Structure formats: structure tokens, C-alpha cells
Design a protein around this ligand. Structure first.
Ligand code: HEM
Ligand code: HEM
Ligand SMILES: CN(C)C(=N)NC(=N)N
Ligand SMILES: CN(C)C(=N)NC(=N)N
Lengths: 452, 452
């Protein structure tokens, strides 16, 4: 789509260069670029990912219309992002009707009822984490969060997905661990992804040469492994629903996409939270005290005891305001429409700048401050769920939201129950976000760990 | 080739943007861009046509080494420019050995001896031009130069190439005229050519889909027509040489490339010259008087009488200084080399900025002034043939140089012998060069024509 579009609609934005559009402006990252735009164009604005017109919108009403109201009719899909092969059938990648059919099939698989049943199995890998954390903190050495939580994230993933019970930290050898480690989030600012943003006409070329964003060796192993398992957790609940019709290949797709969506995310948010606890020892203390008041003398966490903890919730939700790892929510516009008096022409990408809104003065007091109290029950009724969107909104939000909260909360409970986390000379203060396309820390967070 | 190259060699130039390199700087045209660079970087400099490193060089010595000395060993070829199909065999497109073989075969076809024989046949279409010029100036109407000279250029081309004698102006119907009209110079700043400069990886794709810069319908007509002619001028002289071996397809290639190279060029320089004569009526007069002193009372021009005319030559050569329609000379570097102490790495494009040098103060007094006197025999020994290069230099210069001068000179003699050319209200004063990639006037030159 040519570069006249936003002039002809009369929408402000940075003047695009030929071929590139505004990509060079990503040298700061999606996160800063989005702020600067909000700051200087106001409430609504447009830019070009190559030839692709992207309309940022920041009106809570409009957001709700896009994310909630017209989701089924107009704004159903995310923007295509690269050669995906069979993963076109993964719920997060799938489109229109085929997506609605898959969302319906998998919805009951993420019931609180089912979650409740998985708690005992997630709980088990708190004990494991604790154990691994004991040894390596008892050494006196500064721990690397990403590897500690990564190993935990996958421990909870392999076990809740495939029933395969492993100690990821003490089994790097295991074939099943080697592969799921490579299932990382894509950095859409790296050279591969920038290129196909500027050469989208290359996606079909790549499709045909069998090249795929989901590495073939990993996808092969997991399909051929689900092949065996099926011959004799999430796998099961899916097997059990066999429009309607979850098919064979559709099932492996989901299995894989649940790993993709949950692994580096969970472990990534967990890191950010421990960083905030270590740099705010008062918040750390207050939580450690709430946990003891509910689970006295290292009592094991449970579904209900987890949902009892206001301060925990406050800390988790406050960390997500600052570090909304999705950064943006997007939908592609299926047809010409008028939303809250605004004309959106077919093919444009509607983008909601979650990270920017999460840090907008209009909604937030001292937005840069880690301040769990914003989420206290007697002072959160003024938080707009269309401004605060770490899991998106509407029929296409994070299907694994409640699973990811519970899982994280179980990590933190066991970890804080046994330990305290502290600053160091390598600990970067304050934290500085990476310049690429993932919301991660520039240098992976290292902290000191002690036995309580 | 990445954008580190000229930093790592320590050569100055404009900082390239990613993917584009310096192409946006072409919004002024090759002509201004080259000046500004010379003006601000000095004698030698580098820029990037997309990912393609281009080394401009302006030292007469270096130029001579590139264009003359190392031509056969290092700098033999021009830069590839697009899908060419069978025209890869045209002498101007052909490479290395295959080029040297074709240059050798066609050299004797451009002897002054052969030229001499074609004079009577070119001469004939002076009479024709005159005739067409009589009528349409006798109307009192302002004449369009490009159509007057275009029609003449092709009249001289069809007849010296294929023996086909036509009145192009009064035969637009003729199949043979319809096609050769479309054989225009390529504008390497237009969208097609800019794209394949930034997507050179697209040339092979285009080759395979049979798409070609030389339009297929025109190339088809000329091949199938040379097909017949051969069954029963330049065609003949080529037929007669049937390494060695001019082949069938190689022959049609040349036939076509001679049309391509001579048609819009000749007519384009001719326009520029009449513009200068009309805006400098003294120079016009002085020439009209030289012509009469050699060819008294409209006597018909001949080879020797044409070569007698110092002032004519002076006017033709002076107009070419200002309007060197090639603009640049280029060679691709076959291997790493050191030329006059300068390291040129393999694959770089050596570019000589003819138009810029033609207007460099260091060599030229009041460079913007149309001043035929710079070329007078008693004041031209200080003109460096490596600064003044309207036909390039060395073994790969314009093979049709002497033909094009003679042909032009025969146009001008007959035209000035019968007429005078004058300014008008539509005549742009002074002339402003186009912003694209051909050195042509922005608005096609219109002048008034009278009977002497
Ligand atoms: C803290 C961890 C997590 C965060 C912050 C997170 C956030 C998000 C966000 C922002 C979206 C996009 C929603 C939208 O477009 O409006 C999303 C989609 C999704 N998430 Fe998560 N997520 C996390 C963990 C998980 C986990 C554990 C799963 C487990 C299966 C999961 C599965 C998905 C799926 C399948 C989608 C796509 C839904 C669809 O297209 O219908 N996520 N997530
Ligand atoms: C005023 C008219 C003309 C001008 C200014 C002109 C100028 C040039 C220039 C600058 C080159 C490039 C030389 C180099 O790379 O160093 C060239 C090449 C060439 N010209 Fe012309 N030319 C004109 C008319 C003609 C005519 C009538 C022919 C007739 C056949 C012709 C045939 C060629 C050919 C074949 C080449 C390529 C030579 C090779 O690659 O070996 N030109 N011309
Ligand atoms: C969870 N997945 C796979 C996404 N759709 N990506 C995202 N925006 N979080
Ligand atoms: C005559 N031809 C075809 C060229 N090589 N182009 C040019 N630079 N004048």
C-alpha cells in the first residue's frame, strides 16, 4: 500500500522513505518509537512498515471497538509474519473461520477447572526449582535469572503439555529439552524479519523452498514424538475432542504453539518480577510476609491459596504494566469500515501500542515507578482494561492468561518462601531495555540469592 | 557489497542508507548528484547504488589507466543493467572475450572508408529533412526539434542499416517506422530501473519469465525482417564477414543495438545544437557563413567538405561538452588491483563523471557558457581527452563516433544552408535539464524556422 494513504485520510505520522517506509525509525525499538509517536501526534497516527500502512490508535473506546466489538466481522486476524508452513494451522496464526473453529475447540482446555487439575503438576516443579536454586545460591555465586526460570518454564511446559517429567537444568542431554529450548520468541527487528517486512513478496518464495520460521528439526521432533505419545496434560485434553473436528495435524500445531507462546514469555516475566523485588526489598519483604500469613512455615501453595494473595497479584500485575512483553496488539482490517467516526480502509494494520499506553501520563501517576499499590482493590477501579492490556482484549486475547498467571504465581511463592533476592555489582541499575524487537533486558539480569 | 567498503578503504562519500544506499540522492539526477560530490569530496569518492559500490574517479591519469591501459585485463565490461535476453550478444552488452571478438568483427564496418561510401545515402535524407522543414516552417508555426530530427535520425538509420528507404515523417503508417520509434534510450532513474537497482536479485527472475528491457514485439519484428532481407548499408557489411565468426543471432543483435545507440542520441544532440544556434544568432551566422564559403550557393555537402569546416566542428564539439548525453562512463572491476597507487577491490564499479568533468572549473573557463572558440585549433591543445569524453575513451569507446559526427554534420549543413532558427515565447531561456536519468531537456525544445 502506497505512502499517500495517511495524507489522503488526513492522519498525522512520520514521513515515510521510499521502499523502507519508516523502518529506520526502529533503531530505537518498537517501544520507544511508539512513545515518541504518541507524544508528538496525539491520539491516532500512521506509519509504514515498508509498504504496509499501520494505524496506531489510542482511544479506549476505539480500542474496545477494534478488540471487542468488530473482532468477528472486521478485525479478526493478526498480520501475516513469514513462512509458517503447516503452523498456518496453529491457533495463533490461523485465520477467520478456521481460527474461530480452533478457538472454540481449545477454549474448554483452558478452563479454571482444568487449570485446577494441573496445579498439583506445576506445584511439583516449584520443589524442583527450589532444589536447583538451593545448591547454586548456597555456593554464594550470583544466579542468572533467565536460565533458572527458563529451566522452570520448560519443566512446567513439558509436563503440562506432554506428561513428560524432566529436570531441565539437570538433563540438558535429554532430546526433549534440546528441541524445546530452540522454541524462542521471534525478534521482528532482526535481519531475517526486517527483510521480509520490506520484501513481503518473498514470503511465497520462501514457503515454496520449504523454509520456515519454526525451525524444521524442532518441529519434526515434536510431531514424530506426539506421533508416539498418541499411540499409548494438554495433549490428552486435545486427544479427547477426537464446525468441530480437531484433526491430527491441527493438534500438533497447537501443542507446538503452546510451547512457543508460553516458554520464553513466562520465564521472561518472572525475571522482570524478581528484578523488581530485588531492587525494592520492601515490596519483597511485604510479599514474603503475605505468603507466610497464608502458607505458614513453608506450606505448599494451592489453587485457592494462590488466588487469595492480593499483594502477589498486585506485584505480578504491576510488573506487567512496566514489561508488557507483547509490546503491541495488532489486527488486520478485513474491509472498509467506520469505527467511532474513523474511516479505516481495507488492508491497513490497526495497532494498539500496549507498552506506550502502559506508560501514558494521562492514565498513570509516576509511570516509570514500580508501584504495586496501583492494583490494590481499593484503588484500581480507575484502571481502564483497554489501556492495561498485557494479555490483549476480547475474543482473541491470550488463551493461556489464567494458566500463565497461576504458573508464575506458583514459581514465586515457592521461591520467596525459601529465599531472598538481592542487587549486585553486575546488576544494572536502573534496568535498560534492549534495542531490538523483543521486550527483554539488554544484559540478562543477575541477582544474589540467599536461604531464609 | 556491504556499506563498510569505502570507510575501510578510507574513501569519502555520502553515508548510505540501508537497502537503498544513496539512491534517494538521485532526486536531482545523475548530473547534479555527480557535481555535488566532486565539489565536496574532491578527486575520488564512493557511493552505493543499493548494495552496489561505485567509485567515482576524476584524475585524468587514473581515467586513462582505467579506460585505456587496464581495459583488457581488469576494466573490460559495463555494469549489468537488466534482463536482456538474446541482446546479451549485442556488442555493447557482451562481456570479456565474447566482447573482444565482436569488437574485432565490427571494427572494419566503421572505417572512414565505409563511412565515405554511406555519405551519398545519408546526404539524401538532408534533402528530405529540408523538404519537411520547408513546408512546416513556411506555415509560420514553431517547430518541435525532437520530431524533426528524430524523423531524420531514423531516416538515416533505416537506410544505412537495412537499405530500407523511407520518409519517416510522411510514413508513420510504415511497419518499419512504428517499431524503431520504440527503440528509445532507457531512463535508469525510472521506477523499473530503480527497482532492479535495488533488487538486482530480480534480474534472473525476470530473465526466466522472458521479460526484457528491449521490448519483445520490436525485437521480434526486426529479427523476422532481417530474416527476409538476408534471403535476397550495415546489414550487408556484416553479412560479408560470413576467434572470428559472426553468427546469425549475433548479427541481428548488432543491427538492433546500432539502432538503439544511434537513434535518440543523434537526434538528441542535434536538438541541443540548434537550441544553442538559435539562442546565439552570432554563432549561427558565423557558421552559415563558413558553410557558404565551402559550399557556395547551397552546394551539396560531401565527406571532404564536411571535414573542412573548423567552425562546424567547434560548434558540434562545444555543444557536446555541455550535453554529453552519456553523462557517465563506467567499468566493472574484474579483480583486485592497484591503479596509480589506488586499491580497487574486485566487483566495484569504476565511474567517470563525464558531465561533471565537462563543467569542472579546474579545466574550463566560464564552464556554463556556450563558447565554440574553446575548440579552435590555435587554442585546444590544453583540452585533456580524459576530461572531454562525449564518446568515452579507449578500446571500448563509441564505435559509431565518426559516423555520428558525419551524420549530424550533414544534417546541420543542409538545414542551415536553407534556414535560420529563432527563439520564441515557449522557448525556455535559459534551458533547464530534466530531473530523470537521461540528459534531455525538461520541455522539448521549440524554435521558429525561416527560409533564407
Ligand atoms: C506472562 C506470560 C504471557 C503473556 C504476557 C502473554 C501475552 C499474550 C498476548 C498479549 C497475546 C495477544 C493477545 C491479542 O492479540 O489481543 C497472547 C496470545 C496468545 N497467548 Fe499468551 N501470554 C503469556 C503466556 C501464555 C501461555 C502460557 C500460553 C499457553 C498456551 C499462551 C498462549 C497464547 C495463545 C495461544 C495466544 C493466541 C490466541 C489467539 O490467537 O486466539 N500464552 N498472549
Ligand atoms: C552523438 C551521438 C552519440 C554519442 C554522444 C555517443 C556516445 C557514446 C558513448 C559515451 C559510449 C560509451 C563509450 C564508453 O563506454 O567509453 C558509446 C558507446 C557506443 N556507441 Fe555511441 N554515441 C553516439 C552515436 C552512436 C551511433 C550512431 C552508433 C552507431 C552504431 C553508436 C554505437 C555505439 C556502440 C556500439 C557503443 C558500445 C561500444 C562497445 O561496447 O564496445 N553510437 N557511445
Ligand atoms: C502468543 N503468540 C504466539 C502471539 N500471537 N504473539 C504475541 N503477540 N504475544
Ligand atoms: C551506446 N550504448 C548502447 C551504451 N553503452 N550506452 C551509453 N553509455 N551511451
Amino acid at each position: 500500500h502506497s505512502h499517500g494513504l495517511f495524507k489522503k485520510l488526513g492522519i498525522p505520522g512520520p514521513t515515510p522513505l521510499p521502499f523502507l517506509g519508516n523502518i529506520l525509525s526502529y533503531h530505537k525499538g518498537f517501544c520507544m518509537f511508539d512513545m515518541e509517536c504518541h507524544k508528538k501526534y496525539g491520539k491516532v497516527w500512521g506509519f509504514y512498515d515498508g509498504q504496509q500502512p499501520v494505524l496506531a490508535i489510542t482511544d479506549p473506546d476505539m480500542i474496545k471497538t477494534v478488540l471487542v466489538k468488530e473482532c468477528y466481522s472486521v478485525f479478526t486476524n493478526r498480520r501475516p509474519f513469514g513462512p509458517v508452513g503447516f503452523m498456518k494451522s496453529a491457533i495463533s496464526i490461523a485465520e477467520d473461520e478456521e481460527w474461530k473453529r480452533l478457538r472454540s475447540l481449545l477454549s474448554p482446555t483452558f478452563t479454571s477447572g482444568k487449570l485446577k487439575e494441573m496445579v498439583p503438576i506445576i506445584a511439583q516443579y516449584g520443589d524442583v526449582l527450589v532444589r536447583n536454586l538451593r545448591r547454586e545460591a548456597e555456593t554464594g555465586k550470583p544466579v542468572t535469572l533467565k536460565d533458572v526460570f527458563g529451566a522452570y518454564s520448560m519443566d512446567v511446559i513439558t509436563s503440562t503439555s506432554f506428561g513428560v517429567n524432566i529436570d531441565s537444568l539437570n538433563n540438558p542431554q535429554d532430546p526433549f529439552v534440546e528441541n524445546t529450548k530452540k522454541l524462542l520468541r521471534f525478534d521482528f527487528l532482526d535481519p531475517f524479519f526486517l527483510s521480509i517486512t520490506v520484501f513481503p513478496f518473498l514470503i511465497p518464495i520462501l514457503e515454496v523452498l520449504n523454509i520456515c520460521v519454526f525451525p524444521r528439526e524442532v518441529t519434526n521432533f515434536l510431531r514424530k514424538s506426539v506421533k508416539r505419545m498418541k499411540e499409548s496434560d494438554f495433549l490428552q485434553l486435545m486427544i479427547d475432542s477426537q464446525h468441530k473436528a480437531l484433526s491430527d495435524l491441527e493438534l500438533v500445531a497447537q501443542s507446538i504453539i503452546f510451547i512457543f507462546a508460553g516458554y520464553e514469555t513466562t520465564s521472561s516475566v518472572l525475571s522482570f518480577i524478581m528484578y523488581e523485588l530485588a531492587t525494592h526489598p520492601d515490596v519483597q519483604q511485604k510479599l514474603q510476609e503475605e505468603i507466610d500469613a497464608v502458607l505458614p512455615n513453608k506450606a505448599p501453595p494451592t489453587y485457592d491459596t494462590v488466588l487469595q494473595m492480593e499483594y502477589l497479584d498486585m506485584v505480578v500485575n504491576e510488573t506487567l504494566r512496566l514489561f508488557p512483553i507483547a509490546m503491541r496488539l495488532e489486527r488486520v482490517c478485513k474491509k472498509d469500515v467506520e469505527i467511532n467516526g474513523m474511516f479505516i480502509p481495507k488492508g491497513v494494520v490497526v495497532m494498539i501500542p500496549s507498552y506506550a499506553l502502559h506508560r501514558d501520563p494521562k492514565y498513570w501517576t509516576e509511570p516509570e515507578k514500580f508501584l504495586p499499590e496501583r492494583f490494590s482493590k481499593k484503588n484500581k477501579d480507575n484502571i481502564d482494561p483497554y489501556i492495561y492490556t498485557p494479555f490483549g482484549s476480547g475474543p482473541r486475547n491470550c488463551i493461556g492468561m489464567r494458566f500463565a498467571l497461576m504458573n508464575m504465581k506458583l514459581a514465586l511463592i515457592r521461591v520467596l518462601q525459601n529465599f531472598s533476592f538481592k542487587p549486585c555489582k553486575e546488576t544494572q541499575i536502573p534496568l535498560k531495555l534492549s534495542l531490538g524487537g523483543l521486550l527483554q533486558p539488554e544484559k540478562p539480569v543477575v541477582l544474589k540469592v540467599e536461604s531464609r
